Design a protein around this ligand. Sequence first.
Ligand code: 2GO
Ligand code: 2GO
Ligand code: 2GO
Ligand code: 2GO
Ligand code: 2GO
Ligand code: SPO
Ligand code: LDA
Ligand code: LDA
Ligand code: LDA
Ligand code: FE
Lengths: 240, 281, 302
Amino acid sequence: DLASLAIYSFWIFLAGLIYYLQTENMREGYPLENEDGTPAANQGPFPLPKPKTFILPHGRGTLTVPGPESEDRPIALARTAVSEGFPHAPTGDPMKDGVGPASWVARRDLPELDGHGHNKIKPMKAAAGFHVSAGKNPIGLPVRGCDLEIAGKVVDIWVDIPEQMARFLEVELKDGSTRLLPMQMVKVQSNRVHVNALSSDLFAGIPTIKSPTEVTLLEEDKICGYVAGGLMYAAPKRKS
Amino acid sequence: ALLSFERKYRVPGGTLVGGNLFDFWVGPFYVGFFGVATFFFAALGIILIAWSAVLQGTWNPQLISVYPPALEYGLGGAPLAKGGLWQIITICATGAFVSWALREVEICRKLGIGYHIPFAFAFAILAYLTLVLFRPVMMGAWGYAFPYGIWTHLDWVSNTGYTYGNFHYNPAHMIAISFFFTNALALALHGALVLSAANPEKGKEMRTPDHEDTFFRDLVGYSIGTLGIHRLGLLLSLSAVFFSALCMIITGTIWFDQWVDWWQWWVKLPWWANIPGGING
Amino acid sequence: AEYQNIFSQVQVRGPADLGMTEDVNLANRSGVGPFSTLLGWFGNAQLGPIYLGSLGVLSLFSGLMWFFTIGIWFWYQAGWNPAVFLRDLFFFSLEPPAPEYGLSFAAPLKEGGLWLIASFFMFVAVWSWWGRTYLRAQALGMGKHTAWAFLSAIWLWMVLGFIRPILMGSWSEAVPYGIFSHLDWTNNFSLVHGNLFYNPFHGLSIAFLYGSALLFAMHGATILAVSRFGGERELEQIADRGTAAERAALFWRWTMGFNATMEGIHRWAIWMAVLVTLTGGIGILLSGTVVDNWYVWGQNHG
Ligand code: 2GO
Ligand code: 2GO
Ligand code: 2GO
Ligand code: 2GO
Ligand code: 2GO
Ligand SMILES: COC(C)(C)C/C=C/C(C)=C/C=C/C(C)=C/C=C/C(C)=C/C=C\C=C(C)\C=C\C=C(/C)CC/C=C(\C)CCC=C(C)C
Ligand SMILES: CCCCCCCCCCCC[N+](C)(C)[O-]
Ligand SMILES: CCCCCCCCCCCC[N+](C)(C)[O-]
Ligand SMILES: CCCCCCCCCCCC[N+](C)(C)[O-]
Ligand SMILES: [Fe+3]
């Protein structure tokens, strides 16, 4: 035996489980491509799974995966070698082009909705009655970049309503327009908010939102993309 | 071959050592300096383990076993066939692990993400070094470390354990185990929750984080949150391992008697040590 | 250096969240509890509301009943003295009836009847609680995953206190209520069966347990690394993949040469974890019923 039977059976089950698990995780990104975008030759031993359809709430439609994959966006890179597997150099300014660590996905250009169908992220001013409840309130702090120049000033916190947590700092620039900075990329200190990723002069370069009381999945990716890329690409102006 | 969204990310940069020299991939694997370093150590390591399996006289994988120098050798070297292989293999293993963590860092940098992963991996590495470096050095001999063999390492665990009686009574072991069990319970909960929301009853629309928060509060009167649960898992898991290494760093150094006995500090406290009745009086 | 996102830098509170309604009977939900600023550095600040309802009440009652049955017997073992009680707290033990009684409810209260009582109270408390994990999801429109996963835990526990004792013909085969004594049961069980290191399901259970710690570390560390692109927002990333999902996949692909999806990683997870108790349940169940000694069994690879 019984124990032998039980162990033998298990291993067989386990093998099937791994199969089901591996194929499940091939719902996105697959089939494999060559650097040119054509389907790569060897896909490996695992098949693609029969697709599945997720029903999005709030009439936002469906997603069905696996499905036809594409970037739905230009990619400012070019090869730097004559054979597969070497880096691809940015054709332009990688920050503005949204490549490398500055990369953003062409997600939906609407904002995530909470369970009730309302915008999930709001500026706190338009969010009632949300307020800072613990820790240093960043609102009104000057914002300093990795070049140690002030780049602006915090003029609200954007917050996740269902989850009640800070997601962005809305920051005013020398020209009086604003930008969202990912909460996770700023250090609130006693007397200032510090941003290591960007030098002061790249703040204006941050992607901007089309409407000033929401932010869409797409603009979030451009913004988080842009700022993270700062790490690699503002390496010239940093320093300390 | 590249995943459908991969090319935009495969830019130059992020390496720690040697600039663009090894800045390239090999299939899906990134290389870099530490890719090479890793390969080297692991290769040498495997060769040496296969050499040891020749000297031991077997090719069976359930029998191959590489033992540390015996207790008499102390912290000095030992002939290849009498411990020195294990010694070198150990150096190689550490080489491979640290290189693997550092290669992981280089990946992070090319990807503009956080460093949490190789930070977490570092905890496993330190558990390893406790067992084969810090404890054996503090006890005076390589011989106190475990042997590299599938079933022989289980003997080392079992022998080491019963040396202190039933090892359950080591309190750090207790705390460690609690974290392991809890972590596993949280893995099951998180996994199941996300999947219950993404894969609702037939026909219904995908639920939302609001449903997830609701489900927990409904069930237990609290919900940690989607940021929280990822903070938790990491902390449960690292803490389990932290307390693991802590429990063996102290066993055979600051405590060497029966773990069961250690507990008598509590029972023999002045304010009740002598009151008769119960299990101890 | 940078900010790591293990604790929050600023908390924000808004009005109490009373949760989604769906098909829940809001009559049975409580009102909100306090708000822990302390908790809020790490996770949510809001305590409550909790749904009760009658299955809840049953579990909660039965659970305390179980607990109290044990505590009464501990107090009693301490000769009603408070200081002895605290001193010997980890040593007290509610033992099951002696082999004499086999599977009968004949045993005296002082000699194992009490164990059976506290055990009855526990059996009720747990299963109802299970029905609760199913129902609370049903009422919300959600998958049954959580109740299925919980069943995996229930399995091992059932095997230990119920199925395996029955199959062995006595309640004395079962685990006692007591901190130190249950560790002793565990040690002894291994000895009397020839070392569980030789039981291959124990070996599997270990792999998964260690594996759960490895996975959740990776997963946990990964989400945090990509929290700067909103990774923690897993459901929306599932329904519309962002650079967060992508950078995640790619770190792992470049590191170990293959990777997951933002939904699939959770499938790995739910399995890695349930597999701990699953294998473990079988392993124990087989011990003493089919295999008397795992070393011996192992000598014949079966
Ligand atoms: C710290 C919490 C947790 C614990 C529970 C944990 C445990 C374990 C165990 C265990 C419980 O026993 C194992 C076996 C384990 C293994 C891994 N962890 Zn691990 N691990 C954890 C956490 C992490 C984290 C964040 C990460 C790993 C990563 C990794 C990776 C590391 C891969 C690596 O380092 O590659 C470089 C070296 C290679 C490929 C070969 C080395 C050859 C060497 C020189 C010769 C072998 C020497 C040994 C001492 C032989 C002993 C044999 C005997 C005991 C059977 C593997 C899958 C690594 C990874 O890639 O994950 C897929 C990674 O990023 N791990 N891990
Ligand atoms: C008879 C033995 C006795 C019994 C009483 C006992 C019981 C138990 C139970 C139980 C149910 O009764 C449990 C649950 C339990 C658990 C524990 N005990 Zn325990 N325990 C005992 C005795 C011991 C002993 C000697 C030890 C533990 C140790 C531990 C530990 C075991 C977990 C641990 O410490 O994990 C650390 C992980 C390491 C060291 C893995 C390192 C991986 C490395 C960095 C990377 C490896 C990469 C590979 C080589 C890659 C290969 C190629 C790849 C491509 C696949 C926990 C706290 C463990 C420890 O704390 O480690 C620091 C240890 O050394 N235990 N223990
Ligand atoms: C993959 C399997 C994994 C393993 C690792 C696992 C292990 C364990 C262990 C262990 C390692 O030994 C334990 C101890 C454990 C426990 C649990 N698991 Zn568990 N568990 C796992 C997995 C799961 C899963 C999916 C689930 C649980 C769920 C649960 C639940 C089961 C809940 C239950 O059965 O409750 C009934 C009885 C109760 C509540 C009374 C208890 C008395 C108590 C001591 C009194 C003190 C506090 C009172 C409640 C306050 C009352 C105040 C009054 C005045 C009103 C608990 C937290 C259960 C759950 O509810 O989780 C929050 C659930 O859904 N578990 N679990
Ligand atoms: C952690 C406490 C202690 C230490 C001494 C210990 C360490 C290690 C190391 C190390 C520090 O480097 C490794 C690599 C290791 C490996 C094992 N131990 Zn192990 N091991 C310990 C204790 C235990 C215990 C009780 C048990 C294992 C069992 C096992 C089993 C299962 C471990 C496991 O699943 O851990 C979680 C990791 C997962 C799921 C990733 C997959 C890792 C892969 C299967 C391990 C590769 C093992 C190779 C054969 C190692 C050599 C490769 C080299 C030649 C390049 C394997 C053989 C496992 C078993 O079934 O043993 C045959 C089991 O029951 N281990 N083990
Ligand atoms: C002398 C000890 C001996 C050695 C050989 C040994 C060693 C080890 C090591 C090591 C030496 O390093 C490790 C790492 C190890 C690990 C294990 N061994 Zn182990 N192991 C030993 C002996 C045993 C024994 C008897 C058993 C295990 C079992 C297992 C299994 C245990 C799997 C597990 O996670 O168990 C915990 C979960 C349980 C028990 C489920 C209970 C859930 C229940 C439904 C909820 C009840 C909740 C109450 C109502 C309380 C409410 C609380 C309130 C807050 C609401 C693990 C993997 C476990 C098992 O499955 O084994 C196959 C088991 O029964 N082990 N084990
Ligand atoms: C401060 O003091 C007061 C009085 C307030 C309360 C204090 C109480 C105390 C001190 C409580 C302490 C409790 C402790 C230490 C409990 C320890 C519990 C442990 C470690 C349990 C571990 C394992 C238990 C298992 C595996 C039990 C499994 C049981 C089952 C599967 C149920 C089987 C059911 C049976 C046998 C009954 C069948 C009967 C019928 C009628 C169907
Ligand atoms: C120090 C131990 C060296 C282990 C040898 C190589 C690892 C391969 C994994 C064992 C496979 C066993 N199998 C399936 C052949 O029976
Ligand atoms: C769900 C969270 C539960 C946390 C409990 C983890 C088990 C460890 C219990 C001992 C506590 C000791 N410690 C580490 C806090 O000092
Ligand atoms: C989610 C599945 C992950 C698979 C992990 C499998 C690890 C292999 C462990 C080998 C077990 C050894 N033994 C003696 C029990 O056969
Ligand atoms: Fe997750």
